[PDB]
Amino acid sequence: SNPADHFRPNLKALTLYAERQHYVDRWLHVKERWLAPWYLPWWSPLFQLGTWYSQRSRNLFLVENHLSYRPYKFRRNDEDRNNPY
Amino acid sequence: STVAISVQGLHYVGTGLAAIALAGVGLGIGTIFGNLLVACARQPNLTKMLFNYAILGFALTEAIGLFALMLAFLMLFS
Amino acid sequence: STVAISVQGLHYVGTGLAAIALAGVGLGIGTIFGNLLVACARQPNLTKMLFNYAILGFALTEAIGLFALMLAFLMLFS
Amino acid sequence: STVAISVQGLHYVGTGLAAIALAGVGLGIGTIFGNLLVACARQPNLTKMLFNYAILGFALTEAIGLFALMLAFLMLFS
Amino acid sequence: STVAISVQGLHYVGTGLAAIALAGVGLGIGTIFGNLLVACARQPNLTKMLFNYAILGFALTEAIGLFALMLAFLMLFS
Amino acid sequence: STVAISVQGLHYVGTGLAAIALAGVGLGIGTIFGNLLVACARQPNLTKMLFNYAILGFALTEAIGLFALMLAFLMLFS
Amino acid sequence: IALAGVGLGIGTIFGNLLVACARQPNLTKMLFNYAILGFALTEAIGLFALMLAFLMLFS
Amino acid sequence: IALAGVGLGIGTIFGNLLVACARQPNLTKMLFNYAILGFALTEAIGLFALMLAFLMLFS
Amino acid sequence: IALAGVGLGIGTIFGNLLVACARQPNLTKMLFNYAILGFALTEAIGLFALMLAFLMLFS
Amino acid sequence: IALAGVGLGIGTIFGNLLVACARQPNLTKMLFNYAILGFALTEAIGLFALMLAFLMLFS
Amino acid sequence: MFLFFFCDLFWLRLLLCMYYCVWSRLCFIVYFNCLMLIFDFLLFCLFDLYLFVGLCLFLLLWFMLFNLYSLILYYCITYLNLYLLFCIVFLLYIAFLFLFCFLCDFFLFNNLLVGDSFMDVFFIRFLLCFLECFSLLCRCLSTFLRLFCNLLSSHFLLLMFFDFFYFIFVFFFYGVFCYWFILFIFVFCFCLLFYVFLYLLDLFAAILQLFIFCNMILQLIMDFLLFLLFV
Amino acid sequence: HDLPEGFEFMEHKVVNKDIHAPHENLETLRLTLTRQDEFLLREEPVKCVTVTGTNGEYGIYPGHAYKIVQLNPSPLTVEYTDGTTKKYFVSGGFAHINNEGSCDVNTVECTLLDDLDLAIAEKELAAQQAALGSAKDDKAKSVVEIRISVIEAVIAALKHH
Ligand SMILES: CCCCCCCCCCCCCCCCCC(=O)OC[C@H](COP(=O)([O-])OCC(O)COP(=O)([O-])OC[C@@H](COC(=O)CCCCCCCCCCCCCCCCC)OC(=O)CCCCCCCCCCCCCCCCC)OC(=O)CCCCCCCCCCCCCCCCC
Ligand SMILES: CCCCCCCCCCCCCCCCCC(=O)OC[C@H](COP(=O)([O-])OCC[N+](C)(C)C)OC(=O)CCCCCCCCCCCCCCCCC
């Protein structure tokens, strides 16, 4: 155990936490702000690049109908194999 | 009934098994040098070159033995 | 009666057994280099070409040991 | 009396035993390439054909290794 | 239920396994000397350079045997 | 719960394993003498120097055997 | 099991002996003596293992 | 299991016997005697393992 | 497991036989007889191993 | 596990067969027939091991 | 989760800035074979076979700054993680593979179908092609696994031996003044010999493993190179 | 102006057996024992021939595989199908064995073992051993040792029978 502990980075300085929802929402706000102006038509390749793949992924998530249960990505405890909740 | 048991002494057994891997490594190293002697007597002009390749093979063969020896230490010290 | 038992030191045994596979890999490597040394003395002009093939075998021989080494970790750390 | 016991940790031993089968595959590959080097020195004009046959032999041995790993992974998980 | 068990005599088992690692080491050393005799008989003038390389191979092979022996004695006193 | 168990028949098992290493030594002896005869036939003039080197190989191989044998007897009486 | 190597080791000596004798039939006596020497040395280890087996059998 | 190292050792002797015979076949009558001698020693080792296999199987 | 040594030993004898026969085909008859002799000996050891198996499986 | 000593023995026979065919390429038929004989004998040993394996498996 | 940390090369970066503000020749390279792919004259390749030189040199420099200096006690291999090495090897290997595939020359893969027309196509050649396609990815995985495991095992062994040496040196040196001084002297000499041997072995093995790491990539590249002859 | 090659005037060529051919059971080996461009025996059918090459002794019977042997100073035996043994002594050369059933043993010198004298051989060994003691340099000693090896082989060859 102790010898195994010698293989860690030795210059850790700071750790920051952020919820997926929050920064995803902020990114969406930024994307809307930059893609909103009239001088960027919806048919431009840039706008489609920005929007279409995200729309496709979200639609795929919504359409999903799985017989099994997928535990919440951001639980408080995900180390117990016998407690998905 | 649900019973959970934790045997401490098993780590010794796993450690001894890994040591068996050294039998192949130790034998493999001897194989290289045996060929080296039988090769130097067939072409002594290259003895220095052959000696270099033999040492290279020894390290590669030895490197594997260390992998097993690491696992021995991991279990012997946990 | 239905009895469930969980022995918590058995993964040491499985790890050691997988480590034993490294003896064959070590021996095979020694065999390759033994053949290399005895083969270079026969056709020295092609020494370099033989060396490249020798390393190729090592690449295709060390990889197998990694699978066994991989299983060791999958059981040693679980 | 009728007693039923279910040990959860015995799949580690089975996985380790299956992993031992790789020692033969590793040694067999070493034998293939050891002879390849000797053969190339003997008749270097046929290096490509010998290399092709050696690869074929390695593939068959690797296929056996895959079967052994399949059993190892199955027992490890199942 | 949580049950902790400590088996004493297991260290004897692990130590014996490490002793088996000396089988290949002993065999490997014998292989080197056997090859040495042939090389000397086929090239009698090189009775010293071959002898030196044989000693070098023995030392490396002896080292591997000593790595296992350290675990063999260590577990016996653990 | 903390349970301490002392098995008094496992000092036999470790002893038997330590004896297995003798096979790797005994076989090593035959290899040296297996090739000594060939060397003598190849170069009968060196029937003496080859014999001395073979004795050196046998003694060194036997040294490994006795190192293993020491562990065998220690666990037999302890 | 220690006898497995000892028995095999003897076969190796008596295998090469035939090749050596066929190559140099004039030296059968000297080769034969060395083969006996090797057999005795291997047998010594065989008795060591045999001694341990019997001790653990009647103990 | 010790028999594995005995039966294999026997095969090794005979394998070398064929080569020795196929090298100089006029010495077959001499090599064959030596080959039997080797079989007489390795087989003797197998008896010791067989003895233990019987003592423990009937005790 | 003892059959592993017997099976390998039998293959070893025949392996040398092919080399010996190719070297001197004129002696195939004599070599073949000796090869069978070796098989008759290695298989005999196998009988003991099987006998022990049948003497413990049916016990 | 006994099959391990069987498959290896079979590989030994064929490995020597190729060399024998290379040394004496006109004697392929006799070598091929003898190799088949060795395979049958070795395979018979493996079948005996399989017999015990199935007997215990269904017992 | 966002962790801010630093590599352990800042002093080495300072030394590089100090000693390489002026030009200097380079004549010794760990993997020289990336510069000489063609050995028979009049053979030339239309593919950018020399594209790997810069990456090879940079990787050698980076891994040598890390691994070789790791022998110094307490020096940290900041990148020593299995999946990080996997990402590195994935980048390199898959980049070259996609460079070959984007070429849109399907005939380039004809050699995957091993054997000749004599062999049964479905039961032999197709299986061999499957195995070789698998073997490419296995080669990638093996490269990264080998690089990881060599370092891990070497440093574990070094740490354990150093701990044992410290223990015996500190708590058993008084035996020099005692009647059993000879045993301690023998043990100390053996430990010194082992120390030297381990350091030499690790020094050699690091460079050798870098050589092999680069050689696997170069072999991938060479497996799909075709050389034209000048006329 | 093209000149004939000196082998065109030789009408006894070497017959090689095609690899893709059936085997034949042969009871006779056609031996050609030659010394200094002179055949002592010519395509003679014999039962077997024993030759002492560098690695060891070879007993060649009909059908022996293709091989080339570098002889050493030693006796050579020829046993006929009748049951008669003829023993020569050679100082060196080569022996070519063909799978077709032929053996061409070309020697620098091939003398019947009867011609050699053991008394002359014995006293020569004593003289050469004295010469080796007085040998000036390493080369001279090596040459003297070559003579002794041949002499001892001759002495041992005659003492055998
Ligand atoms: C809230 C708290 C604060 C933190 C906020 C953070 C916000 C985060 C937002 C979310 C981010 C999410 C994702 C994070 C992923 C992180 C991954 C990671 O860490 O990977 C490891 C990985 C480690 O890489 P590495 O191999 O160690 O090499 C990177 C090194 O930087 C070395 O690489 P290099 O050497 O190759 O780099 C080139 C280098 C080439 O070399 C140099 O240039 C040499 C200098 C190197 C400087 C950089 C090294 C820093 C060393 C440690 C700090 C130094 C001391 C600081 C003192 C602070 C005191 C409180 O040049 C530079 O660095 C250029 C900058 C030079 C600045 C010089 C300034 C001079 C000012 C002079 C003023 C004079 C005034 C006079 C007035 C007089 C009046 C009379 O990190 C990176 O690769 C970089 C990660 C950065 C991600 C972006 C983060 C967002 C930006 C944050 C800026 C905050 C500024 C405000 C701070 C105020 C004080 C509190
Ligand atoms: C190309 C091959 C290069 C070979 C280099 C060979 C170097 C030989 C060094 C001999 C011994 C040196 C001893 C130094 C002692 C320092 C003080 C001390 O206490 O150290 C103890 C330390 C550790 O000793 P320790 O383990 O006894 O420490 C005990 C301390 N306690 C008890 C607290 C744990 O010494 C070392 O770690 C030295 C190991 C050196 C290994 C070789 C490293 C080579 C790679 C780095 C080269 C860097 C070159 C950079 C050049 C510029 C580049 C641009």
Q: Is K28 exposed, middle or buried (0-12, 13-18, 19+ CB in 10 A)?
A: exposed
Annotated binding site of B for UTP: 42
Contact C37, E35 (CB under 8 A): no
Token look-up 């018979």 returns J44
Q: Residue L136 contacts by C-beta under 8 Å, 6 or more apart in sequence?
A: none
Contact G41, H50 (CB under 8 A): no
Whether residue L126 sits in one domain with residue L109: no
Residues E75 and F64: their CA atoms lie apart, in Å, by 19
Residues I32 and J38: their CA atoms lie apart, in Å, by 11
Q: How many residues are recorded in chain B?
A: 78
Residues spanned by the domain of L43: 21-116
- Please report whether residue L13 resides in a domain: no
- Please report whether residue L48 resides in a domain: yes
Contact F57, E34 (CB under 8 A): yes
- Amino acid symbol at B9: G
Q: Is the CB of K162 inside a 6 Å radius of any atom of ligand 2? A: yes
Contact J51, I9 (CB under 8 A): no
Whether residue L81 sits in one domain with residue L30: yes
DSSP helix/strand/coil, I3: helix
Which one of the ligands is nearest to K66 CA? Answer: 2
DSSP chain B: -EEEEEESTHHHHHHHHHHHHHHHHHHHHHHHHHHHHHHHTT-GGGHHHHHHHHHHHHHHHHHHHHHHHHHHHHHHT-
Token look-up 């001088």 returns A39
The helix (run of H) or strand (run of E) holding residue D70 is: helix D47-77
- Please report whether residue L44 resides in a domain: yes
Chains J and L touch (3+ CB pairs under 8 A): yes
Residue of G nearest to H21 (CA): G22
Residues D15 and D6: their CA atoms lie apart, in Å, by 17
DSSP state of K121: I
Buried b (16+ CB within 10 A) or exposed e, F17-53: bbbbbbbbbbbbbbbbbbbbbbbbbbbeebbebbbeb
Q: Helices (DSSP H) in chain F: which residue ranges? A: 10-42, 49-76
Please list every residue in chain F whose beta carbon sits closer than 8 Å to the beta carbon of residue G42.
26, 29-30
Nearest to L60 by CA among L41, L43, L47: L47
Residues K118 and K45: their CA atoms lie apart, in Å, by 32
Residues F36 and A42: their CA atoms lie apart, in Å, by 89
Residues D15 and J47: their CA atoms lie apart, in Å, by 26
Chains D and H touch (3+ CB pairs under 8 A): no
Nearest to J31 by CA among I19, I37, L160: I19
DSSP helix/strand/coil, G46: helix
Chain-centroid distance of CA C31 in Å reads 13
- Please report whether residue L160 resides in a domain: yes
Q: Residue L111 contacts by C-beta under 8 Å, 6 or more apart in sequence?
A: L88, L89
Give residue K150 CA to ligand 2 midpoint distance, Å: 20
How close, in Å, is residue I8 to chain J by CA atoms?
A: 4
Whether residue L128 sits in one domain with residue L101: no
Q: Residue I42 contacts by C-beta under 8 Å, 6 or more apart in sequence?
A: H7, H10, H11, I6, I9, I10, I13
Treating both helix axes as pointing N-terminal to C-terminal, what angle do D11-20 and C47-76 enclose, rounded to 10 degrees? Answer: 170
- Expressed in percent and rounded to 5, the helix, strand and coil fractions of chain D are 85, 5, 10
Among the partner residues D12, D41, D69, nearest to C75 by beta-carbon distance: D12
Token pair listed for K159? 């740490």
Contact K206, K67 (CB under 8 A): yes
Q: How many residues are recorded in chain K?
A: 231
Please list every residue in chain A whose beta carbon sits closer than 8 Å to the beta carbon of residue K76.
8-11
Residues K18 and K12: their CA atoms lie apart, in Å, by 10
Chains I and L touch (3+ CB pairs under 8 A): yes
Buried b (16+ CB within 10 A) or exposed e, L36-74: eeebbbeebebbbbbbbbebbbbbbbbbbbebebebbbb
Whether residue L31 sits in one domain with residue L98: yes
- Please report whether residue L16 resides in a domain: no
How close, in Å, is residue G30 to chain H by CA atoms?
A: 14
Token pair listed for F54? 């073979």
Whether residue L136 sits in one domain with residue L57: no
Residues L16 and D22: their CA atoms lie apart, in Å, by 46
Give residue K14 CA to ligand 1 midpoint distance, Å: 16
Which neighbouring-strand residues pair with L112? Answer: L88
Token pair listed for G26? 């004039």
Residues K142 and K220: their CA atoms lie apart, in Å, by 13
Annotated binding site of G: 23
Residues B2 and L112: their CA atoms lie apart, in Å, by 95
Residues C61 and D34: their CA atoms lie apart, in Å, by 12
Q: Residue I15 contacts by C-beta under 8 Å, 6 or more apart in sequence?
A: H15, J12, J13, J15, J16, J17, J38
- Please report whether residue L152 resides in a domain: yes
Whether residue L107 sits in one domain with residue L33: yes
Q: Residue D29 contacts by C-beta under 8 Å, 6 or more apart in sequence?
A: C28, C57, C60, C61, C64, D58, D61, D62
Nearest to K8 by CA among K80, K58, K59: K80
Whether residue L81 sits in one domain with residue L136: no
Total domain count, chain L: 2
Q: Is the CB of K18 inside a 6 Å radius of any atom of ligand 2? A: no
Among the partner residues H1, H11, H23, nearest to I9 by beta-carbon distance: H11
Q: Residue L79 contacts by C-beta under 8 Å, 6 or more apart in sequence?
A: L46, L47, L48, L49, L50, L85
- Please report whether residue L143 resides in a domain: yes
Residues D58 and D31: their CA atoms lie apart, in Å, by 10
CA distances (Å), origin K194, targets B58, C16, E67, K199, K200? 16, 25, 11, 8, 10
Residue of H nearest to G5 (CA): H5
- Please report whether residue L90 resides in a domain: yes
Among the partner residues B10, B16, B24, nearest to E24 by beta-carbon distance: B24
> For G44, left (φ over 0), alpha (ψ -120 to 50), or beta?
alpha
Contact C70, D28 (CB under 8 A): no
DSSP helix/strand/coil, A52: helix
- Phi and psi torsions of D50, nearest 5°: -60, -40
Q: Helices (DSSP H) in L35-137: which residue ranges? A: 118-133
Q: How many residues are recorded in chain A?
A: 85
Angle subtended at Cα H52 by Cα H46 and Cα H58, rounded to the nearest 5 degrees? 135
L88 is in an annotated binding site: no
10 Å Cβ neighbour count for E66?
A: 15
Residues A52 and K145: their CA atoms lie apart, in Å, by 38
Token pair listed for E69? 């022996």
Residues L120 and L12: their CA atoms lie apart, in Å, by 39
Residues G31 and G34: their CA atoms lie apart, in Å, by 5
Which neighbouring-strand residues pair with E6? Answer: F4
Tell me, letter by letter, the H, E, C secondary structure of A4-45: HHHCCCCCEEEEECCCHHHHHHHHHHHHHHHHCCCCCCCCCH
Q: Is B67 exposed, middle or buried (0-12, 13-18, 19+ CB in 10 A)?
A: buried
Chains that touch J (3 or more CB pairs under 8 A): I, L
Whether residue L123 sits in one domain with residue L109: no
Contact H42 G7 (CB under 8 A): yes
Contact F67, E20 (CB under 8 A): no
Contact E9, F47 (CB under 8 A): no
Q: Is C14 exposed, middle or buried (0-12, 13-18, 19+ CB in 10 A)?
A: buried
Whether residue L108 sits in one domain with residue L31: yes
Q: Is C46 exposed, middle or buried (0-12, 13-18, 19+ CB in 10 A)?
A: middle
Which neighbouring-strand residues pair with L68? Answer: L96
Please list every residue in chain D whose beta carbon sits closer than 8 Å to the beta carbon of residue K127.
63
Whether residue L93 sits in one domain with residue L158: no
Residues G40 and G13: their CA atoms lie apart, in Å, by 11
Q: Is the CB of K165 inside a 6 Å radius of any atom of ligand 2? A: no
Please list every residue in chain H whose beta carbon sits closer than 8 Å to the beta carbon of residue G42.
none
> For K23, left (φ over 0), alpha (ψ -120 to 50), or beta?
beta
Whether residue L123 sits in one domain with residue L96: no
Whether residue L96 sits in one domain with residue L47: yes
